[PDB]
């Protein structure tokens, strides 16, 4: 028996003389003012665990230099990797940890040089290969009262370390336990190889063995192993120290890098422009020689007041109506999303800083011919031309404190024209994008959330913009009529009836592939062939049009805002690459790609890589005899885009799709497409669409989702009163749209029931492009209902109005109950029968006003 003779003591030990004995003599580091300020949200300077210290005193002692590629196995939390961020030799840092259910979930730390920090949750380090790396950290070892198990466990990660060891790496290894006479032979066999030792840490609790093999010491084994034996044993009769503090390890703040660069940016055009905005500052223009970006040209930042949130509101007065779902977490787990400076960085990080390989010479020529023809199509019985200034103006009606009070107010008119006259020279000075996040209730977060960005422009450069290229959106180039394949000017609801009307179609199945981050893989062989336009223009409209596309689209200049460890600035950036009217080019790109990809399914060309002289001809033969029949299969809205080609051979014709950019998502490059062969399942607009039969026979289609998503996304807002009009908002959209769920007209019902009257409903409900927000009047909403199915619905033919709520006919019990209902739950009919209770203590809240009441009898 080794000095193992301690553990028999430890394990074998008083329950309270344990936890006595476990701090007597140590070193710890006072956490209950980390701890405390990590529940708080702050994000900043803080460890997140008691592990940061740890290594601070191993690096402190020079016994590991971490540098450069550094792995980190069992990050936990984050503590050693967090740690190593803010360290300067080191470069980046690959957190893994197992997590999950029992184990111990990552946290998000904006500390210095968070943004060299990956961490990766759900991963057993032991099944995952081996990479490349200059510095190797493992903090696996779960202790045990029977030493044999954890001699066992020790040996499991001592092999395991050994395959991601090099000759010439450095390396911090948990040893749990070390004085076992396996692990002393592994680790003195370890050791002749890799070398370094054994070190004991003077902030490991009494209660373990805990020894750390660290590449830059030196020392017998053995020895060292019994050297703590002793110390061990000992302090089991030292009468009970103390336990002497050290400070906790203050991270820091903000984000480094400065090493890459890898975007020649002209200057010769974005130059004129960016000695604007250090001219309007300098009393603030800095250069941050740490900035995060990679594939975006950086050019210094100034002082700037943060804005954004990250917050979350219930709507309790939607939320007291949905007593039933306080249970469904798809529901009560959907946060807001975070537009703070830094989740704008962290989505920044992630989804922006990418770059898209050039595309092959021969999609290259794919790309333009399809494009080339298209627009020449596109305009067959269009012309395009300028808006007018009082267009404009006249847009101004919803869509200088304001833009109203800014148009009407000669003085922009000429700061318009000062540029202006710019672009038509060959300039600009203000035309840049100012990137902010997207708030939106995307769910996901655990008490967290975030996804999007939204360029948006100077008020004043959107008139530059829209007077080239608005004649898109605003003759209608985009619609279904004209397009063939786009959807535009079209009612969410009426979406339903253009996927029927695409399954009448003789083909495979109905396909909708989702696009990874569309416009992040907008390629420049994207932007000069949308550029094409102008072949279709002449005089002082091609010039403008130019300038817009040329100056602004392939050339732009942003600011985005990141937080330093000295305040928010505003760092100002340039990507060539990429796209912010962004709509009809999304629609116009991503029917051009879906023509290339229906073309691969179908042979016309056998190779991305080069497009062979009879080849390229097919294409022109193929796209002249049945281009307008195939655009005539797809339904296409922005980058979302639902096709039906002649065969499944599709499902499988990507190198085309890959090489474009417009890589799917969820899914392996080169894995085959999911055909759907019922039109009621495919998605398109974040909805499907059901056929529902009424009582006199008419068909109707109706937009439908998984009720949860619906529900979720009402119960968050960004007084009683400004949040009672909140549901209103949603309890209006739920009738005229969703009114075939029985779950959410009863819900809707109660809403409206609750809500004095009178109330007008207000914020948008949804930021769906396809959404008319026809639920917004105050009108009797059976009025709207007829209004929108029966009274202007085209695929509605017999126009005999409905005039009740009872001839309104629901979807079948298990359509409801599939696309998500609780109808068939005994909560669920409780909260029905005793409903008319919690619309009480909702009206006896709002108020004493005046109430309809719609709750059928
Ligand atoms: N097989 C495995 N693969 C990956 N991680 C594991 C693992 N077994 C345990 N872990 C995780 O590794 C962590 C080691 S304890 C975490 C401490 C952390 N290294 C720090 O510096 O603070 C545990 O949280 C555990 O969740
Ligand atoms: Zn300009
Ligand atoms: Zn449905």
Redesign the pocket.
């Known amino acids: 028996t080794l000095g193992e003779k301690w553990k028999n003591r430890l394990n074998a030990l008083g329950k309270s003389e344990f936890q006595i004995y476990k701090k007597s003599g140590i070193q710890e580091v006072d956490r209950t003012l980390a701890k405390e300020g990590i529940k708080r949200g702050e994000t900043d300077h803080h460890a997140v665990?008691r592990?940061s210290a740890?290594?601070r005193w191993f690096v402190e002692r020079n016994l590991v230099t971490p540098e450069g590629k550094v792995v980190?196995?069992?990050?936990?939390?984050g503590?050693?990797s967090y740690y190593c961020g803010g360290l300067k030799n080191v470069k980046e840092v690959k957190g893994?940890?197992?997590?999950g259910p029992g184990?111990?979930e990552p946290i998000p730390m904006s500390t210095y040089g968070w943004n060299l920090v990956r961490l990766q949750s759900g991963?057993?380090?032991?099944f995952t290969p081996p990479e490349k790396c200059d510095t190797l950290l493992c903090?696996?070892g779960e202790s045990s009262p029977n030493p044999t198990v954890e001699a066992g466990r020790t040996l499991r990660v001592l092999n395991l370390v050994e395959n991601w060891l090099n000759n010439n790496t450095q390396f911090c290894i948990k040893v749990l336990n070390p004085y076992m006479p396996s692990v002393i032979e592994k680790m003195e066999a370890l050791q002749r190889k890799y070398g370094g030792a054994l070190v004991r840490n003077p902030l490991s609790r009494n209660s373990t063995h805990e020894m750390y093999w660290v590449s830059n010491a030196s020392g017998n084994i053995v020895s060292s192993v019994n050297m703590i034996s002793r110390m061990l044993i000992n302090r089991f009769t030292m009468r009970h120290k103390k336990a002497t503090y050290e400070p906790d390890v203050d991270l820091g703040s903000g984000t480094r890098n400065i090493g890459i660069e890898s975007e020649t940016p002209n200057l010769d055009i974005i130059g004129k422009r960016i000695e604007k905005i250090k001219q309007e500052h300098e009393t603030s223009w800095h250069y941050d020689q740490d900035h995060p970006y990679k594939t975006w040209a950086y050019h210094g930042s100034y002082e700037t007041k943060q804005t954004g949130s990250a917050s979350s509101m219930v709507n309790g007065v939607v939320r007291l109506l949905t007593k039933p779902w306080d249970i469904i977490p798809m529901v009560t787990q959907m946060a807001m999303t975070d537009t703070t400076p830094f989740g704008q960085q962290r989505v920044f990080k992630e989804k922006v800083d990418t770059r898209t390989q050039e595309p092959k010479e021969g999609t290259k020529k794919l790309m333009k011919i399809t494009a080339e023809w298209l627009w020449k199509e596109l305009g067959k019985k269009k012309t395009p031309r300028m808006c007018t200034r009082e267009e404009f103006t006249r847009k101004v009606r919803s869509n200088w404190k304001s833009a109203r009070e800014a148009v009407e107010d000669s003085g922009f008119w000429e700061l318009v024209d000062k540029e202006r006259n710019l672009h038509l020279e060959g300039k600009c000075e203000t035309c840049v994008y100012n990137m902010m996040g997207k708030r939106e209730k995307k769910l996901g977060e655990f008490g967290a959330k975030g996804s999007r960005a939204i360029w948006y422009m100077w008020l004043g450069a959107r008139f530059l913009e829209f007077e080239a290229l608005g004649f898109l959106n605003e003759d209608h180039w985009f619609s279904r009529e004209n397009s063939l394949s786009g959807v535009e000017g079209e009612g969410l609801h009426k979406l339903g009836y253009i996927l029927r009307d695409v399954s009448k179609k003789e083909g495979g199945a109905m396909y909708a592939d989702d696009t990874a981050g569309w416009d992040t893989r907008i390629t420049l062989e994207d932007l000069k062939n949308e550029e094409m336009v102008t072949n279709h223009m002449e005089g002082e409209h091609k010039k403008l049009a130019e300038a817009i596309f040329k100056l602004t689209y392939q050339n732009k200049v942003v600011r985005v805002q990141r937080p330093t460890p000295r305040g928010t600035v505003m760092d100002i950036i340039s990507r060539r690459d990429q796209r912010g009217v962004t709509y009809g080019l999304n629609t116009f790109t991503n029917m051009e790609a879906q023509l290339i990809r229906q073309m691969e399914g179908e042979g016309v060309f056998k190779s991305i890589q080069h497009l062979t002289v009879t080849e390229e001809i097919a294409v022109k033969n193929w796209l002249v005899r049945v281009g307008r029949e195939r655009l005539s299969r797809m339904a296409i809205s922005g980058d979302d885009c639902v096709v039906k080609p002649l065969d499944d051979r599709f499902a499988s014709a990507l190198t085309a799709l890959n090489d474009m950019g417009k890589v799917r998502k969820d899914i392996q490059q080169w894995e085959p497409s999911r055909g759907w062969n019922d039109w009621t399942q495919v998605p398109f607009c974040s909805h499907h669409f059901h056929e529902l039969i009424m009582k006199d026979g008419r068909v109707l289609v109706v937009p439908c989702r998984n009720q949860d998503e619906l529900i979720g996304r009402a119960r968050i807002s960004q007084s009683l009163r400004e949040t009672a009009c909140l549901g209103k908002s949603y309890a209006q959209m739920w009738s005229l749209m969703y009114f075939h769920r029985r779950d959410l007209r009863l819900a809707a019902n109660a809403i409206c029931s609750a809500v004095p009257s009178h109330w007008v409903p207000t914020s948008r409900t949804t930021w769906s492009i396809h959404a008319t927000h026809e639920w917004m009047t105050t009108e009797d909403m059976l009025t709207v209902w007829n209004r929108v199915w029966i009274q202007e619905n085209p695929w509605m033919e017999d126009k005999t109005p409905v005039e009740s709520w009872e001839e309104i006919p629901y979807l079948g019990k298990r359509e409801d109950q599939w696309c998500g209902s609780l109808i068939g739950l005994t909560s669920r009919a409780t909260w029905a029968k005793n409903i008319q209770t919690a619309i009480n203590q909702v009206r006896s809240l709002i108020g004493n006003e005046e109430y309809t009441d719609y709750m059928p009898s």
């Open positions: 665990s592990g740890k290594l980190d196995l069992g990050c936990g939390r503590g050693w893994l940890t197992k997590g184990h111990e991963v057993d380090v032991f903090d696996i």
